[PDB]
Amino acid sequence: KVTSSLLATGLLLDITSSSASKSFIYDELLAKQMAWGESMEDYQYNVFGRSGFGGYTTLINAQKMVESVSDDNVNAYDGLAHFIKAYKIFYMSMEMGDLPYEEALQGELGLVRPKYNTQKEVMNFILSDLETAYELFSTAKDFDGDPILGGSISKWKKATTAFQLKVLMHLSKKESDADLKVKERFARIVASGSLMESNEDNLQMKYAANTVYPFHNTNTKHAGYAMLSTMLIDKFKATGDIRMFYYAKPAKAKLNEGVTADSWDAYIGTDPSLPFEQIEKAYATEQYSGFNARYTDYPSGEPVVRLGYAEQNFILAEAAVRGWISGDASAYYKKAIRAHMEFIASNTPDEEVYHHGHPITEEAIAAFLETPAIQLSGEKEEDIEKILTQRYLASFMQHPYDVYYDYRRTGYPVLPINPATNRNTMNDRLPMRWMYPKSESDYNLEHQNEALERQFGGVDDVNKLMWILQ
Ligand SMILES: [Cl-]
Ligand SMILES: [Cl-]
Ligand SMILES: [Cl-]
Ligand SMILES: [Mg+2]
C-alpha cells in the first residue's frame, strides 16, 4: 500500500518534474530568454492571472510519511518533510505574498479556515523549518525512496544549506529588518552548514531510466517554435561566449546565404518585445535561431536543476559584493561560470551537431574566465549586474521561475519592454506577483481579505509589491 519510501518518491518527483509541453518554457518567455513563434503568448507579453494553492496538498502526504516510518530512522524522513514544506510554501509565497503557514495543515484537513500569515512571518517560519531540517538530517542515517539524491544524508545536508542561502538571498531587499537577521544568518550558514563541493551535488532531474528530456522529439512537436532571444545571442556575441553555440542552432536563412555554422554571424537573436506580427514574419522566413539539437534530438538533453553548484557560487558572489560574507567575490563568480561550462561539457557529446565547431574545453574555459569584458570592477551596482547577468545566462532552461524572481529582486538583467506591445495593465513593466486562487475567496474569504487589505489596500493586483519586494 503506502510506506514512507513510496511517499518520499512522490514528494520528490513533484519538486523535480517538468511538463513535456509548452509550459516548460513559460518562465523562459517571462524572463525574455526566448520568443515563441506559434502564437502570441501571455508570458511573452507579460499577462499574469492567478496562481494556485496546490502546494499545500503535499503537507498531508509528508505527515503520513513521517508517521509511517517503520525503523528507527524517523529523523531522515522528518528532515525531508520539513525541507519539502519550506520549499513548497516558499515558492507559493514568492508567487503571491502572504498565505497560511501555522494553520496550513489544519486547513488541508478541513479543521479550520486557515489564517494567512504575513509574508515576513512566512519567511521566518520557512527559515526555522530549514534549520530543523538541517538538524534532523544531521542526526539521521541514509534512507530509501529518494531517486534524486539517493537518500544520502551528506547530500541532503548540502541541499538544505543551498536552499537556506537561496531563500536568504531572496530576502536581500530586507537586509535592515531587525528580526529577520538576513546577513547574519547567511554568514552563519556559510560558516556552519554544508557547502556544495561540485556539480555532483546538484539536486536535479537527469534524463535517460526509461525517460526523456521534456523537449525531446518523442515528447513534443512544439520545441521548433522556440526563438532564442537577443538577451542571449547579443550578450554572448559581445563577450565571445561560446555557450551560444551550445544553446542555439544557426538561423536557416543565414545557412542559405552560405554563412557557416561555426560563424558568429549565422546566429540571430529575436527581440521578444517586438509586435507579434513581426516575430511571426521572422519565424516564417527563418530569420531566427532555434534550440540547439541537444535540447530536442538528444534523449538525455541536460539535467534540470533546482539547486546547483554554479548557482550557489553566483549566490556567494553576490553576498560577497554586498558585504554579507568576507570571501573574494571574483573567485566565487569564476567558480560559478566555470561550473556551468563544465556542466554543459559533462552532459553534451563532443560532436559538431552540438558544439558547431566550438567545443567547451579546459582551454576555452580558462580563456573565457579572464575576458576583460566580464571582470568585476569593484563598483557594487556594476558587479551585482554582472553576477546576475551571468546567472541569467547560466540558468536558461534551469531553475523554473527563479530568473524572473531574481529580476524582481534586483532589476537585472534589464529586460526588453515595449510600451506599444506590453500586454500588462502597466505598459512599462512586468507584473510583480500572481493573484490568489479563486478557491480562497470561495472558501476562506475573510482570511484572504484580511491579507489583501494588509498587503495591498484590499485589491488582489498583479502590479502590487509584496513585502519582500518593498
Ligand atoms: Cl556529499
Ligand atoms: Cl503585438
Ligand atoms: Cl524565469
Ligand atoms: Mg522553463
Angstrom distances, CA of residue 462 to CA of 71, 95, 98, 436:
48, 10, 14, 10
Question: Do 366 and 257 sit in the same domain of this protein?
Answer: no
- Taking the centre of ligand 4 as the mean of its atom positions, its distance from the CA of residue 255, in whole angstroms, is 28
- Taking the centre of ligand 2 as the mean of its atom positions, its distance from the CA of residue 113, in whole angstroms, is 43
Q: Give helix 380-394 / helix 402-410 axis angle, nearest 10°.
A: 170
Could you say which ligand is closest to the alpha carbon of residue 24? 4
Task: Give ∠ CA 246-250-253 in degrees, rounded to 5.
Answer: 170
Contact 367, 373 (CB under 8 A): no
Residue 90 annotated in ligand binding: no
- Taking the centre of ligand 4 as the mean of its atom positions, its distance from the CA of residue 398, in whole angstroms, is 6
Question: Do 79 and 151 sit in the same domain of this protein?
Answer: yes
Residue 27 annotated in ligand binding: yes
- Taking the centre of ligand 4 as the mean of its atom positions, its distance from the CA of residue 232, in whole angstroms, is 15
* 351 in a structural domain: yes
C-alpha cell at 285: 522566413
How many whole angstroms separate alpha carbon 264 and alpha carbon 84? Answer: 44
Q: Cell 478557491 appears where?
A: 439
Residue 224 CB neighbours (<10 A): 15
Q: Cell 499545500 appears where?
A: 56
- Taking the centre of ligand 2 as the mean of its atom positions, its distance from the CA of residue 276, in whole angstroms, is 4
Could you say which ligand is closest to the alpha carbon of residue 194? 1
Phi, psi of 50 (to 5 degrees): -95, 145
**Residue 321: closest CA among 392, 381, 407:** 381
Residue 113 CB neighbours (<10 A): 16
Domain boundary among 261, 285, 308: 308
* 210 in a structural domain: no
- Taking the centre of ligand 2 as the mean of its atom positions, its distance from the CA of residue 273, in whole angstroms, is 8
Contact 251, 260 (CB under 8 A): no
* Helix, coil or strand: residue 41: coil
Could you say which ligand is closest to the alpha carbon of residue 397? 4
Could you say which ligand is closest to the alpha carbon of residue 40? 2
Kindly write down the DSSP assignment for every residue of 345-373, as one continuous string: HHTS-SSHHHHTT----HHHHHHHHT-GG
Question: Do 257 and 179 sit in the same domain of this protein?
Answer: no
* 219 in a structural domain: no
How many whole angstroms separate alpha carbon 9 and alpha carbon 20? Answer: 20
Contact 232, 413 (CB under 8 A): no
Tell me the H-state helices in 171-229. 182-192
How many whole angstroms separate alpha carbon 33 and alpha carbon 226? Answer: 10
Contact 104, 56 (CB under 8 A): yes
Residue 135's DSSP bridge partners are none
Resolution in A: 2.0
- Taking the centre of ligand 2 as the mean of its atom positions, its distance from the CA of residue 404, in whole angstroms, is 22
The experimental technique used to determine this model is X-ray
Angstrom distances, CA of residue 382 to CA of 321, 322, 373, 379:
10, 12, 12, 6
Kindly write down the DSSP assignment for every residue of 236-299, as one continuous string: HHHHT-TTHHHHB---HHHHHTT--TTSGGG---B-TTS-HHHHHHHHHTT-S--B-GGGTTST
Question: Do 27 and 90 sit in the same domain of this protein?
Answer: no
Question: Do 232 and 342 sit in the same domain of this protein?
Answer: no
- Taking the centre of ligand 1 as the mean of its atom positions, its distance from the CA of residue 157, in whole angstroms, is 8
Which residues touch 239 (CB under 8 Å, ≥6 apart)? 368, 371, 373, 374
- Taking the centre of ligand 4 as the mean of its atom positions, its distance from the CA of residue 4, in whole angstroms, is 30
Could you say which ligand is closest to the alpha carbon of residue 152? 1
What is the bridge-based pairing of β-strands 203-205 and 304-307?
A: antiparallel
- Taking the centre of ligand 2 as the mean of its atom positions, its distance from the CA of residue 267, in whole angstroms, is 24
Could you say which ligand is closest to the alpha carbon of residue 392? 3
Q: Which helix (H) or strand (E) holds 341?
A: helix 329-346
What is the bridge-based pairing of β-strands 34-36 and 304-307?
A: unpaired
Question: Do 103 and 181 sit in the same domain of this protein?
Answer: yes
- Taking the centre of ligand 4 as the mean of its atom positions, its distance from the CA of residue 397, in whole angstroms, is 5
What own/partner pairs with CB < 8 Å and gap ≥ 24 does 348-356 have? Answer: 348/246, 348/294, 348/298, 348/302, 349/298, 352/261, 353/293, 353/297, 354/246, 354/292, 354/293, 354/294, 354/298, 355/245, 355/246, 356/245, 356/249, 356/250, 356/261, 356/262
Rg (CA), the chain: 22
Residue 362 annotated in ligand binding: no
C-alpha cell at 245: 553555440
159-179 as b/e, with b when 16 or more CB fall inside 10 Å?
bbbbbbbbbbbbbbbbbeeee
Question: Do 452 and 399 sit in the same domain of this protein?
Answer: no
* 122 in a structural domain: yes
Which amino acid is located at 219 in the chain?
Answer: N
Per-residue DSSP letter, 201: G
- Taking the centre of ligand 3 as the mean of its atom positions, its distance from the CA of residue 431, in whole angstroms, is 13
C-alpha cell at 329: 567575490
Asked if the peptide bond before residue 413 counts as cis, ω within 30 degrees of 0, the response is: yes
327-336 as b/e, with b when 16 or more CB fall inside 10 Å?
eebbebbbbb
Which residues touch 241 (CB under 8 Å, ≥6 apart)? 235, 368, 393
* 45 in a structural domain: no
Question: Do 145 and 1 sit in the same domain of this protein?
Answer: yes
How many whole angstroms separate alpha carbon 147 and alpha carbon 199? Answer: 17
Q: What is the CATH number of the domain that holds 409?
A: 1.20.120.840
Q: What share of the chain is helix, strand, coil (3-state, %, to 5)?
A: 55, 5, 45
Contact 283, 225 (CB under 8 A): yes
Question: Do 176 and 84 sit in the same domain of this protein?
Answer: yes
How many whole angstroms separate alpha carbon 231 and alpha carbon 267? Answer: 13
Residue 34 CB neighbours (<10 A): 28
Instruction: Give the domain extent around 270.
Output: 17-38+224-308
Could you say which ligand is closest to the alpha carbon of residue 159? 1
Question: Do 67 and 150 sit in the same domain of this protein?
Answer: yes
Number of domains in the chain: 3
- Taking the centre of ligand 1 as the mean of its atom positions, its distance from the CA of residue 364, in whole angstroms, is 29
Residue 227's DSSP bridge partners are 35
Question: Do 277 and 387 sit in the same domain of this protein?
Answer: no
Question: Do 264 and 143 sit in the same domain of this protein?
Answer: no
* 429 in a structural domain: no
Task: Give ∠ CA 63-65-113 in degrees, rounded to 5.
Answer: 20
* 211 in a structural domain: no
Q: What is the CATH number of the domain that holds 115?
A: 1.25.40.390
* 425 in a structural domain: no
Task: Give ∠ CA 205-211-215 in degrees, rounded to 5.
Answer: 75
